[PDB]
DNA sequence: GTCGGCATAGTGACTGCATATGTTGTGTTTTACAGTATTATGTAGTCTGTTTTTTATGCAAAATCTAATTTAATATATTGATATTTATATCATTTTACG
């Protein structure tokens, strides 16, 4: 039901790194916010980059 | 209320502060499969007694089928006037025949 890190990442314009996407994570720069499983975080497949400021 | 001249009026170009973004590097925390071992699994390889199915006769029940037999029905045989069918084959009308 849900994507992973990579599996939502991959379907984005522009793939940016592994740690860049994790960082707008902790700073929720992505709503609706992924809820982490157990190592990995699972992001909703409409979940979208919201950029604010 | 239009036409003529600096003042309006957002949008676009320009420059550097300010900060999220892009790398590099150390280090903790937990996922993820390989390899041997334990034991209840599902089918396997047969034996055995009960249930199921094929099988070999057995016999009262049922009335046709064949031969003995009698008789109405059928055939021969007359005789002779009168009524019906008869040989061929082109026209005409009824009934069979397939789609």
């Known amino acids: 039901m849900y994507l992973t890190?990579?599996?939502w990442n991959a379907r984005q314009r522009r793939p940016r790194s592994l740690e860049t996407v994790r960082r707008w994570?902790?700073?929720s720069?992505?709503?609706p916010p992924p809820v982490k499983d157990g190592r990995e975080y699972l992001f909703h497949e409409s979940?979208?980059?919201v950029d604010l400021n």
């Open 5 to 7: 890190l990579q599996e």
């Open 25 to 27: 994570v902790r700073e």
């Open 29 to 31: 720069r992505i709503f």
């Open 47 to 49: 979940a979208v980059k």
